[PDB]
Every structure is written in structure tokens, then in C-alpha cells.
Design an enzyme around this catalytic site. Structure first.
Site, short mmCIF file in Angstrom:
data_model
loop_
_atom_site.label_atom_id
_atom_site.label_comp_id
_atom_site.label_asym_id
_atom_site.label_seq_id
_atom_site.Cartn_x
_atom_site.Cartn_y
_atom_site.Cartn_z
N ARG A 202 0.14 4.56 2.94
CA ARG A 202 0.20 4.16 4.33
C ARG A 202 0.63 5.50 5.11
NH1 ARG A 202 4.00 -0.48 4.58
NH2 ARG A 202 4.45 -0.17 2.59
N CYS B 128 0.81 -0.97 -0.10
CA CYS B 128 -0.02 0.00 0.13
C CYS B 128 0.94 1.34 -0.05
CB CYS B 128 -0.77 -0.10 1.15
SG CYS B 128 -1.97 1.40 1.32
N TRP C 273 -9.16 6.54 -0.45
CA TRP C 273 -9.51 7.40 -1.70
C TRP C 273 -8.59 6.63 -2.71
CZ3 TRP C 273 -8.23 9.79 3.01
CH2 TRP C 273 -6.64 10.06 3.01
N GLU D 166 -4.88 4.02 -10.40
CA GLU D 166 -5.75 3.02 -10.20
C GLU D 166 -6.80 2.80 -11.44
OE1 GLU D 166 -6.46 1.73 -6.23
OE2 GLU D 166 -5.80 3.67 -5.58
C1 HEM Z 1 -6.22 6.42 2.01
C2 HEM Z 1 -6.00 6.34 0.97
C3 HEM Z 1 -5.09 5.02 0.30
C4 HEM Z 1 -4.50 5.27 -0.80
C5 HEM Z 1 -4.43 6.08 -1.73
C6 HEM Z 1 -4.07 3.73 -1.11
C7 HEM Z 1 -3.32 3.30 -2.20
C8 HEM Z 1 -3.23 1.92 -2.49
C9 HEM Z 1 -3.17 1.44 -4.11
C10 HEM Z 1 -2.75 2.38 -5.08
C11 HEM Z 1 -2.85 0.01 -3.72
C12 HEM Z 1 -2.59 -0.79 -4.88
C13 HEM Z 1 -3.94 -1.04 -5.76
C14 HEM Z 1 -3.78 -1.86 -6.76
O1 HEM Z 1 -2.85 -1.66 -7.53
O2 HEM Z 1 -4.51 -2.87 -7.26
C15 HEM Z 1 -2.93 -0.04 -2.48
C16 HEM Z 1 -3.12 -1.56 -1.91
C17 HEM Z 1 -3.36 -1.74 -0.45
N1 HEM Z 1 -4.06 -1.14 0.32
FE1 HEM Z 1 -3.91 0.96 0.29
N2 HEM Z 1 -4.44 2.86 -0.31
C18 HEM Z 1 -5.11 3.43 0.52
C19 HEM Z 1 -5.80 3.22 1.83
C20 HEM Z 1 -5.92 1.89 2.57
C21 HEM Z 1 -6.66 1.87 3.57
C22 HEM Z 1 -7.30 2.63 4.51
C23 HEM Z 1 -6.12 0.34 3.98
C24 HEM Z 1 -6.69 -0.51 5.05
C25 HEM Z 1 -7.26 0.02 6.03
C26 HEM Z 1 -5.22 -0.24 2.70
C27 HEM Z 1 -4.76 -1.33 2.62
C28 HEM Z 1 -4.19 -1.88 1.46
C29 HEM Z 1 -4.02 -3.18 0.99
C30 HEM Z 1 -3.90 -4.30 2.44
C31 HEM Z 1 -3.12 -3.07 0.07
C32 HEM Z 1 -2.89 -4.42 -0.88
C33 HEM Z 1 -3.50 -5.78 -0.78
C34 HEM Z 1 -2.34 -6.73 -1.27
O3 HEM Z 1 -1.48 -7.06 -0.31
O4 HEM Z 1 -2.45 -6.63 -2.57
N3 HEM Z 1 -5.09 0.92 2.19
N4 HEM Z 1 -3.26 1.12 -1.68
C1 LIG Z 2 -6.67 -0.91 -9.32
N1 LIG Z 2 -7.27 -1.19 -7.83
C2 LIG Z 2 -7.79 -2.09 -7.15
C3 LIG Z 2 -7.63 -2.20 -5.99
C4 LIG Z 2 -7.45 -0.93 -4.94
C5 LIG Z 2 -7.04 -1.07 -3.68
C6 LIG Z 2 -7.27 0.13 -2.99
C7 LIG Z 2 -7.60 0.14 -1.75
C8 LIG Z 2 -7.92 1.21 -0.78
C9 LIG Z 2 -8.27 1.14 0.48
C10 LIG Z 2 -7.52 2.44 -1.44
C11 LIG Z 2 -7.04 2.56 -2.86
N2 LIG Z 2 -6.70 3.88 -3.26
N3 LIG Z 2 -6.92 1.41 -3.53
C12 LIG Z 2 -6.74 -2.14 -3.14
C13 LIG Z 2 -6.68 -3.29 -3.95
C14 LIG Z 2 -6.27 -4.67 -3.25
F1 LIG Z 2 -6.73 -5.56 -3.92
F2 LIG Z 2 -4.67 -4.79 -3.92
F3 LIG Z 2 -5.75 -4.62 -2.08
C15 LIG Z 2 -6.88 -3.46 -5.59
#
Ligand code: HEM
Ligand code: A1A0F
Ligand code: HEM
Ligand code: A1A0F
Ligand code: H4B
Ligand code: H4B
Ligand code: ZN
Lengths: 415, 419
Positions: free
Chosen positions: A116, A113, A285, A290
Site C-alpha cells: 500500500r 496488502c 506487481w 507470492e
Molecule cells: C503494487 C504492488 C502490490 C504489491 C507488491 C502487493 C502485495 C500484496 C500481497 C503480497 C498480497 C497478499 C496476496 C496473497 O498472499 O495471496 C496483497 C493483497 C491484497 N492486495 Fe496488494 N499488492 C500490490 C498492489 C495492490 C493493488 C494495486 C491493489 C488494488 C487496487 C491491491 C489490493 C489488495 C487487496 C485488496 C489484497 C488482499 C485481499 C484480501 O483482503 O484478502 N494491491 N497485496
Molecule cells: C499468491 N498470490 C495470490 C494473490 C495475489 C494478490 C496480489 C494482488 C496485487 C494487486 C498485487 C500482488 N502482488 N498480489 C492478491 C490476492 C488476494 F486475493 F488476496 F487479494 C491473492
């Protein structure tokens, strides 16, 4: 060892990771092969009593260290109290403070993520008293409404009851709370989001009456206590959407593109102290890429590069004209301009990655490290013009964590 | 035990057994992944200086075994005699000499094994210039000039490597001090800014401190700084008729050419160590042809490199007050369009990141089909722009270290004791 160093090859800044020594679960790599780019390296895999004791202890110890009460009277009694529950009930119940702490730190520990820097501003909704799908729907609606906040998005998570015997799991069957349907047409084409074709079929099979359009918000498919999942229509006034227009290309709005404002992952599993919260939808958000790169431009997704490049009059006869790259950028400008114009929270990949570097550097300062998955942190476009590309990162798995879990329809025993 | 990689666009699954032949540590463990560490491991196949027999022979035997296995001997007359020849040679010199066939096999396979190289579909089409008879920096200059002329081939670039004498005791190293045979000088200005290529500031200063007369421009081809047999390095000017350059213009922006940009045609890595059967070839400059993003993304747009993004954005009249205008991303695309257009117009070999990554996917499938796997470093293989619209981004890869291999090595000025 006892210290690992990570260098930024752009700034020459070097940080020292001691936190990796606290890692307790596997990355998937071995000493002779790196599986860094592998995406995912029985339901009755519920932890036994003897497995649960040390996991619980580790987490309770971690929580009391975090609040500078390690060794305290209340730390020792809590440990004794947890052990009693594990002994008697084969599980235990987190206090509210522990649950909040656990959920926040699972986000803090999510090496994939990039957002964070916000981890400590997470709104935790405790839904552990929920017993039915109707109840879950209510909690999820309140979550969506709170998180959306009329466009001023607030990160939140709603935690449903933990797994017990693996036969009474709560699951959101949706992969996100808000996604668009996808319909395979007889002619091979797809309408809507091709990623959601199978889950759309599941919904239709459960009784959903699909509008059969390009941007149908899917219904929630909610499973409580291991019962068959039930369909629920999110109230449309709760689903904030942004029509995608371009600041310079008048014709862009004519693509009829829109997207939803709230990314809310709902198919992951939250693990705190050995406890498994199989339904824990969380939301934040968007980072613009994405939507503009992956959702719109993956060949397997809406796949609009050709359409946009056609409208842009690009030479599409050869790849070296970089027409795909040229239309990719314009699409991503449009996504950002559109959310910003509609005052819906969004972050562009440049701001997000710069913030993540600051976050990483702060985590090293105060925590001794920050597990980070370069393969996911680097944005899907313009990789090296962002600061994280040049940042060495160490990846390791800390608990509490968010974990993947099998799709429910593969393992659900239908009643 | 036997690992699968999936491509998430195609759902093609490949099954890897080749990793079972991997020798050296990646740096990762079951608990930490070092996949984005530039140099994750110091695990080497042989120790510091000249190995004893029990250190060098097992490496030699393993490579000789592999070479004779490759040609469907193994245990053949010639294989067994080679082992005794290598055995005797190590007994009497503490090293041994590769046959021409072994050298060629080794060089091609180090390239085949280079997990970070997206160009490996060409691996077996490599011109190997044996320069192990070289004794002086003048001879090295002569060999490098021939390499440059052959590889350049009036713009129809040809992959080549020139292999100078292997390391003996470590005090007699052959080194090309340049990181690439052709790079541009970097000059530290009095006002603190940098003229030319900032990466090469320190190496440019060594050259000047060695007597080089810098013309002090933005595209000054660096002299060669060549070290033969551990002696002090010597400066040599590559004859400019051998240094093919491409003026960068744009197929639409007529003003682009007025930016006064050019780049050289030949990427020729010259600071890496070629390791074959425990032999260490510390001067092994190798060259191929560019992927457009190496010039247009990394060389031109890295912050600590040429950093021409604002310059181009300004000419494009972009909103540069905030990031979300994506002005960097727009200019970045235009620069890479220009780089490709310029090289193709001048009929100088170049490959765009779309075709190069597609070829690599095909190379992977070839390698899994015939070899049981293909080591690949996702972090390095995915291009530095437009990652996910290229197929490699959606391709799971296994990274492991096979031998023969190209290795990094210290910059010789940190090591060299002058005389
Ligand atoms: C607040 C604004 C946030 C932004 C801008 C953000 C951004 C991102 C992005 C771009 C990804 C990759 C998604 C993808 O490429 O499919 C991601 C993954 C992830 N986010 Fe965040 N995120 C946010 C908040 C959060 C929150 C609030 C949580 C949990 C409480 C979280 C947990 C995760 C997890 C667990 C993953 C990856 C899951 C995995 O292991 O594949 N994120 N985030
Ligand atoms: C193309 N995005 C799909 C996708 C978006 C996100 C994600 C989650 C959150 C909380 C914020 C954000 N901005 N994005 C997380 C995942 C996953 F599955 F990896 F956790 C996949
Ligand atoms: C012929 C066309 C070739 C292309 C298009 C190509 C492409 C590339 C690119 C883009 C990189 C990454 C460079 C960077 O990002 O800084 C790379 C790395 C590399 N190339 Fe190739 N290359 C080619 C030929 C060769 C040849 C002929 C050799 C050796 C005989 C070779 C050996 C390597 C090695 C060892 C690396 C990785 C170096 C490291 O580990 O840092 N390449 N290649
Ligand atoms: C950004 N360019 C610098 C750079 C370029 C290359 C390279 C090498 C070859 C033979 C072809 C090519 N097209 N490129 C290899 C490296 C290194 F150091 F990784 F080996 C670095
Ligand atoms: C194969 C590879 O691991 C896969 O395509 C990854 C690459 N990096 C990614 N990075 C992000 N942020 N999201 C993704 O889905 C992926 N997919
Ligand atoms: C930190 C990171 O490993 C480092 O910046 C790498 C990332 N990926 C790369 N990929 C390529 N092709 N070339 C590079 O120089 C780098 N640099
Ligand atoms: Zn790894």
C-alpha cells in the site's frame, strides 16, 4: 477508546491509532474471541434506499473532507444530488473524481496488502459504460497492456458497472486476469496449477479447447449485465511471462518453470459509498514470495519443493535437515533473479516489508492509523527476519473497501 | 455462537464450543482486532491487591467446580466440603490454599490453555514441583537447581514447573527476576555496540549493579536474581554442571564451529504469572525443550538480539549488497540446520518447526474431538521462518482466554521498593 497504541518490539517505536474510531464494519472478532486468522469471517443482498442514504452520505462527506471542501456549497449540492438519485432511482452514480478517490482508498484501506505504499499511484480505468462481455474483454485487454508496460509494471484497476438489483452483475469469473490452467489426470495427478482445476473445468465446459499443458494461460470468462459469461482468449502478446532460472544452479531452467508478470486480482468486489462494483480487476506487481513460496511450494499448488530438493541433492529423509526450507529459499532467489534479469517489476519480501513499515508510519502520521492484518502482511517465509514481524498492527475495516464475494458459478442463474 | 475453523490445505473443519467457557477479554471487538498486539488486554479476574471475599470466592468456586467437574464429581461430598473449606479459609486469611491435586490440575491446564504455545500436545505430561513451603531466596535457588537438574535430565529434557508461594498482599511477592532461568549476559560496550545478548543488557546491568562479577563474554550465563517474600533479590550462580550447553556446528560447513557459538539446552520461562482460581503464583518457572527456530531464528537472528546473519552470510560468501539475493534467508536456513544438527548430535532434546507444527495440528484435532476446541494464537504458533510450508500456517485458529492460565506481569524492578 480515543487512542490505541501499537509498538514495534524491534525498534521500540510506538504509534497512536485514532483512525480505528472511524471504522464502521465488523472484523469478525468478538470481545471474548479473536478470529484474526479466519480467512473469510444472497445475491439479492442489494442495499435498500434507506440503507444506501447514510452510506452515500458518509462517503461523500469523506470525499469532501479529503479535498478540504467539507461543508462547501458543492459538498451540500452533491449530497442533495445523491439523495435525489437514491430517492428516484434507488441508487446513484459516482462522479469520476469520487470513483478514483474511492478506488484508491479501497486500496489504502486493504489491511491485508503489504504494497500500500503505492496506493495513491493507482491508474483508474472507468468502465462503467460497458454493456457486454466483448466490451469487458476490450477494457481488460487495455488494462493488461497498460499495466504490463513492457515489464515496467504500473498498478491499475478497471471498474465495471456497479451492481443494481443483484441480477445484472458484471463479473470476471477468473480469480486473476492471468492464471494457469490446471488439469486433473485420471491417475490422481494434476497438470498445471491445481488451484485452478475447477475453473479450468468450467472453461472447458463453456467451450474452451485446452492445450493440456503445464502453463496454459486461462481464457477470460466474462459476465456482463448478469448474462451468461463468455469466453475470450487474451492475446498472447499481451501476456508477459518470465522463465524461471537460477543465478547459480544451471539445472534450474530445466524445471521448465515460468510465471506471468502481472498479478491482477479479478474476483473481488469494490464497495464505495454503499455502491457495489462486482467486477473491478486490479493489478500491481508481484512480491517474489507470492510466486516462489505460495504458487510454487504450497502442497496444494505447483508443489515443487521435492523436485528442487532432489536436484539440490538434499537429505530428504528427515524434516530436521530443513531440506524444504533450503529449497524454498533457492526457488525464491530464482524467481527474483529471473524477473530482475528480464526487467519485469518485482519486489522481494524484505524490500516490500521495509517499505510497508515506512508506509505504516507515514499513515499514522498523516491519517491517524493504518489498518493492517499481521497474519497476511508477514511474508510466508523468513517471517521474523522481516521488519513487519515485530510490528504490532491493528486490524479494522474502513470503507471504501475491497470485499470478497461468492464465486459466480455458485450463484449464477444460467440463461 | 458455535464457530468453525478450516484448514485450507486439508479442508478439515473443526467446530468450537469451548470458547463459550472463555472468561477474559481478548482485546478485540467487533470493530478492532488486536490479534498482533503483544499484550492486548489488562482484563484480570481479580483486582489490584488482596481481594475482598466477594471478589476472590467466585473465582475460587469456579476453579474448584471445574476441578471437581474434571474428575466426574461435582456436588460430591468432597467438592461441597472443599467449597466450605475454601470459604472458611478466605474468611480467616483473605486467601486459600490449593490441594496438591488442584495445583497439579491447575498447572497442567494453564499450559493446556496457553494459546501461544505450540508445544501443548505434551500438556498433561508435566512434572509439577510444589515449592509453596519456600521462605527465602536460598530456598528458591535450591528449588530452581533441582528443577533445572530434573528437567535437563542429561539432555533427555522433561517438562517441569516449580510453583513458589502465591501472592498474598502484593508486598510479599516471590519473584524470579530473570525472564528465563538460563540466559546469556548482554554488555553495553564503550563504543556503543553490544556484547552478548542485547535483550539482557538491562537485566545484566542490574546483576552487575547487585554485585555480580561479569566475566564479560558472549555466552556468560546470567546469575539467578531471586526474590522471596518481597525482600530484596539475591544473586545466585547456577552450578555450571547443571547448565547444559550445546556447541553449534554445521553438518557441512566445517567453518561453522569456528564461529564460537553455543546455546543452552533448557528453555525455562521464569517471569510469568500462574493464575489458578484467583490465586496468583508470581514465581512459577516452567521449562520444556526448544523448537530449533527459537534459538536459530529469534535468538540468533533478531536484529536486537545476537544478529549473526551478516557474520554467517560472509562466511558463506553471499551477495550482501541487495536484499533480493535473499542472503539473510539462506544464512537463516543454514543456522537452523546447524542448531538442529548440534542438539541432535549431542542427544539433547529439540524439535524442528516442521514436526512441532505437525504435532500441534494433531493436538488441535485431539482437543476439538475431546474438549470442543483449542485456543490458539496463529501469530505466535506459526514459526518465524518458512511459515507457509508448515501446516499451522494454513490452519484457521480461534483465540480465547481460558483459566487457569499463564499471564504476563511487570518486570519486578519497575515495582520493587528496596530496603
Ligand atoms: C503494487 C504492488 C502490490 C504489491 C507488491 C502487493 C502485495 C500484496 C500481497 C503480497 C498480497 C497478499 C496476496 C496473497 O498472499 O495471496 C496483497 C493483497 C491484497 N492486495 Fe496488494 N499488492 C500490490 C498492489 C495492490 C493493488 C494495486 C491493489 C488494488 C487496487 C491491491 C489490493 C489488495 C487487496 C485488496 C489484497 C488482499 C485481499 C484480501 O483482503 O484478502 N494491491 N497485496
Ligand atoms: C499468491 N498470490 C495470490 C494473490 C495475489 C494478490 C496480489 C494482488 C496485487 C494487486 C498485487 C500482488 N502482488 N498480489 C492478491 C490476492 C488476494 F486475493 F488476496 F487479494 C491473492
Ligand atoms: C515441552 C516442549 C515445549 C515446546 C516445544 C514449546 C514451544 C513453545 C514456543 C516456540 C513458544 C513461543 C516462544 C517464543 O516464541 O518466544 C511457546 C510459548 C509458551 N509456552 Fe510452550 N513449549 C513447550 C513447553 C511448555 C511448558 C512445559 C509450558 C508451561 C508449563 C509452556 C508454556 C508456554 C506459554 C505460557 C507460552 C506463551 C507465553 C506467552 O503467552 O507469551 N510451554 N512454547
Ligand atoms: C524465543 N525463546 C524465548 C521464549 C521461549 C519460551 C519457551 C518456553 C518453553 C517451556 C519451551 C520452549 N521451547 N520455549 C517461551 C517464551 C515466552 F515468553 F513466550 F513464554 C519465550
Ligand atoms: C489460515 C490462515 O488465515 C491462512 O492460511 C492465511 C495465512 N496468511 C496468509 N497471508 C497471505 N499473504 N496470504 C494468504 O493466503 C494467507 N493465508
Ligand atoms: C508484533 C508481534 O505480535 C510480535 O512481534 C510477535 C509476533 N509473533 C511472535 N511469535 C512468537 N512465537 N514469538 C514472538 O515473540 C512473537 N512476537
Ligand atoms: Zn481479533
Amino acid at each position: 477508546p480515543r487512542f490505541l497504541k501499537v509498538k514495534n518490539w524491534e525498534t521500540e517505536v510506538v504509534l497512536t491509532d485514532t483512525l480505528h474510531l472511524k471504522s464502521t464494519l465488523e472484523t469478525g472478532c468478538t470481545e471474548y474471541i479473536c478470529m484474526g486468522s479466519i480467512m473469510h469471517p444472497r445475491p439479492e443482498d442489494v442495499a435498500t434506499k434507506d440503507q444506501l442514504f447514510p452510506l452515500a452520505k458518509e462517503f461523500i462527506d469523506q470525499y469532501y473532507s479529503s479535498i478540504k471542501r467539507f461543508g462547501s456549497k458543492a459538498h451540500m449540492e452533491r449530497l442533495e444530488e445523491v439523495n435525489k438519485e437514491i430517492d428516484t432511482t434507488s441508487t446513484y452514480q459516482l462522479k469520476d473524481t469520487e470513483l478514483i478517490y474511492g478506488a484508491k482508498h479501497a486500496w489504502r484501506n486493504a489491511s491485508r496488502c503489504v504494497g500500500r505504499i503505492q496506493w495513491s499511484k493507482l491508474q483508474v480505468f472507468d468502465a462503467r459504460d460497458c454493456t457486454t462481455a466483448h466490451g469487458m474483454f476490450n477494457y481488460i485487454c487495455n488494462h493488461v497492456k497498460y499495466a504490463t508496460n513492457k515489464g515496467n509494471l504500473r498498478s491499475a484497476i478497471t471498474i465495471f458497472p456497479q451492481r443494481t438489483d443483484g441480477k445484472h452483475d458484471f463479473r470476471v469469473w477468473n480469480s486473476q486476469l492471468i492464471r494457469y490452467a490446471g488439469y486433473k489426470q485420471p491417475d490422481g495427478s494434476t497438470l498445471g496449477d491445481p488451484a485452478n482445476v475447477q475453473f479450468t473445468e468450467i472453461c472447458i465446459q463453456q467451450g474452451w479447447k485446452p492445450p493440456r499443458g503445464r502453463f496454459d494461460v486461462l481464457p477470460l470468462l466474462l459476465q456482463a449485465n448478469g448474462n451468461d459469461p463468455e469466453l475470450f482468449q487474451i492475446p498472447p502478446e499481451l501476456v508477459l511471462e518470465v522463465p524461471i532460472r537460477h543465478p547459480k544452479f544451471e539445472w534450474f531452467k530445466d524445471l521448465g518453470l515460468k510465471w506471468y508478470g502481472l498479478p491482477a486480482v479479478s474476483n473481488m468486489l469494490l464497495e464505495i459509498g454503499g455502491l457495489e462494483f462486482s467486477a473491478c480487476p486490479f493489478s500491481g506487481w508481484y512480491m517474489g514470495t507470492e510466486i516462489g513460496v505460495r504458487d510454487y511450494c504450497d502442497n496444494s499448488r505447483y508443489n515443487i519443493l521435492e523436485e528442487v530438493a532432489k536436484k539440490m541433492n538434499l537429505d530428504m529423509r528427515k524434516t530436521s535437515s530443513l531440506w524444504k526450507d533450503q529449497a524454498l529459499v533457492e526457488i525464491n532467489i530464482a524467481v527474483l533473479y529471473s524477473f530482475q534479469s528480464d526487467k519485469v517489476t518485482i519486489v522481494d519480501h524484505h524490500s516490500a516489508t521495509e517499505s510497508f513499515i515506512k508506509h505504516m508510519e507515514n499513515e499514522y502520521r498523516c491519517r491517524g492509523g493504518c489498518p493492517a492484518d499481521w497474519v497476511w502482511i508477514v511474508p510466508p517465509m523468513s517471517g521474523s527476519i522481516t521488519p513487519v514481524f515485530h510490528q504490532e498492527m491493528l486490524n479494522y475495516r474502513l470503507t471504501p473497501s475491497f470485499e470478497y464475494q461468492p464465486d459466480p458459478w455458485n450463484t449464477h442463474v444460467w440463461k
